[PDB]
Amino acid sequence: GVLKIVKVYLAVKRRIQPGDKMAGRHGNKGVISKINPIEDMPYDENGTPV
Amino acid sequence: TEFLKPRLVDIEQVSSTHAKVTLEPLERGFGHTLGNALRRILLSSMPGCAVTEVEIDGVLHEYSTKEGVQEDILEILLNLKGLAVRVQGKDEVILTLNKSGIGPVTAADITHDGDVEIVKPQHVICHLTDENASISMRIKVQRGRGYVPASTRIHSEEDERPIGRLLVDACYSPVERIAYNVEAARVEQRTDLDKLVIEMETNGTIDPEEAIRRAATILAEQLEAFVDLR
Amino acid sequence: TEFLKPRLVDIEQVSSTHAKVTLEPLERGFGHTLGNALRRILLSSMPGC
């Protein structure tokens, strides 16, 4: 019944956002709630932000 | 009111990238007042240049691989995000790069426009393995600020481009890192004064001093609203 | 640079002593930049008797 078939492959670049799921290797899960601007992030004495 | 203005004292540019800026005298508590406010501005608002678009011939999309080239096209694009460019006159320039042969292609190999300085000429772009391989591209560098990803642009950009042309996430912001230390400045009478030492690490070009001027200007512009309108 | 300035919107002077002041629009991050800087000045630096 099928005369001809066309397969298309799309590639999509997905960036992380709130709602995505992240974790370590110790069973520590979490969902991203908010993406904070770098200015607002806690930063050490040296200036390097977390 | 015992108004007291600071004066820009030392600009120890340890490296073109890294620069310390001492600043004194500041009245008590203004070290941190100004220190933090500037730091916030410096990180975000700071305007700069970045590769917005790319076009390599014989390349339809970023996921393909070119023959005679070690790096896949995405890898090349990543390197272009990192490419440090200063455009003096215009806000938009399109640089060309035609290179061949068995060579690690660097930034120097790009044909520099009269008013376009390549800050890190040694910056790696692509590795040409086959000697008969010749790579030819045109990189559009625009001036902007902050971070404008390609996904932001495609969404608002109903303006269709030709296939072939590869849009890139624009990292316009030049300031890589910034921190401020506050030490006590000593006057004959006033030992409660403070000095502000701002340590900046930026990519190429954007001059420590010049960036300071601009950041202070942005803050003052905002203050217009709270002074002038009530 | 496409400098985005805020405009003083509402001044709800609930009392002569107590007043709320809304302010918009501020570009991202400048809320706290300006907010805190002003607060510091307002408290420790405002001269008086």
DSSP for chain B reads ------EEEEEE-SSSSEEEEEEEEE-TTHHHHHHHHHHHHHHHT-EEEEEEEEEETT---TTS--TTBSS-HHHHHHHHHT--EEESS-SEEEEEEEEESS-EEEGGGSB--TTEEES-TT-EEEEB-STT-EEEEEEEEEEEESEE-HHHHHHH--SPPPTT-EE--EE---EEEEEEEEEE---SS--S-EEEEEEEEESSS--HHHHHHHHHHHHHHHHHHHHT--
What are the residues facing B50 on neighbouring strands? B142
What type of residue sits at position A10?
L
**Which of B63, B177, B218, B219 to probe by mutation at the A interface, max A CB count within 10 Å?**
B177
Residue-range domains of chain B with CATH: 1-47+173-230 (3.30.1360.10), 48-172 (2.170.120.12)
Q: Give the span between the Cα atoms of B213 and B218, in whole angstroms.
A: 9
Interface of A to B at Cβ within 8 Å reads: 11, 13, 15, 37-39, 43, 45-48
Cα–Cα separations (whole angstroms), residue A32 to A15, A21, A50, B66: 12, 6, 15, 37
Interface membership of C3 toward B (CB under 8 Å): yes
Check if the beta carbon of residue B85 is closer than 8 Å to that of residue B172.
Answer: no
Contacts of B121 (CB under 8 A, 6+ apart): B106, B107, B108
CB distance C32–B40 less than 8 Å? yes
Interface contact C7, partner B, CB < 8 A: yes
Question: What is the structure's resolution, reported in angstroms to one decimal?
Answer: 3.6
CA-nearest of B139, B129, B127, B122 to B81 is B139
Which of the other chains make 3 or more beta carbon contacts under 8 angstroms with chain A? B, C
CB-based burial, B50-83: b 16+ in 10 Å, e otherwise:
bbbbbbbeebeebeeebebbebebeebbebbeeb
Taking the Cβ of residue C32 and every Cβ of chain A, the question of whether any pair is shorter than 8 Å is answered with yes
Instruction: From chain A, pick out residues whose CB is under 8 angstroms from the CB of B179.
Output: 43, 45-48
Q: Does B78 touch chain A (CB under 8 A)?
A: no
**Residue B182 C-alpha, separation from nearest chain C C-alpha, in angstroms:** 16
CA contacts within 13 A on the Cβ side of B115: 7
Q: Is C39 on the interface with B (CB under 8 A)?
A: no
The amino acid occupying position B60 is L
What gap in Å lies between CA B189 and CA B115, rounded to an integer? 51
Question: Is the Cβ pair C7, B226 closer than 8 Å?
Answer: no
Q: Report how far residue B112's alpha carbon sits from residue B54's, in angstroms, rounded to the nearest whole number.
A: 16
CA dihedral for B62, B83, B94, B132, sign (positive or negative): negative
Burial of B147 (0-12, 13-18, 19+ CB in 10 A): middle
Q: Considering only CB atoms, which chain C residues are within 8 Å of B30?
A: 45
Helices C30-40 & B208-227, crossing angle to 10 degrees?
70
- Which residues of chain B neighbour A11 with C-beta distances below 8 Å? 61, 63
Do the Cβ atoms of A47 and B179 come within 8 Å? yes
Residue of A nearest to B41 (CA): A39
CA distances B109 to B77, B103, B104, B132, Å, are 16, 10, 10, 17
Task: Look at residue A43 and give its three-state secondary structure.
Answer: strand
**Chains contacting B (3 or more CB pairs within 8 Å):** A, C
Is A37 in contact with B44 (Cβ distance < 8 A)?
yes
| Experimental approach | X-ray
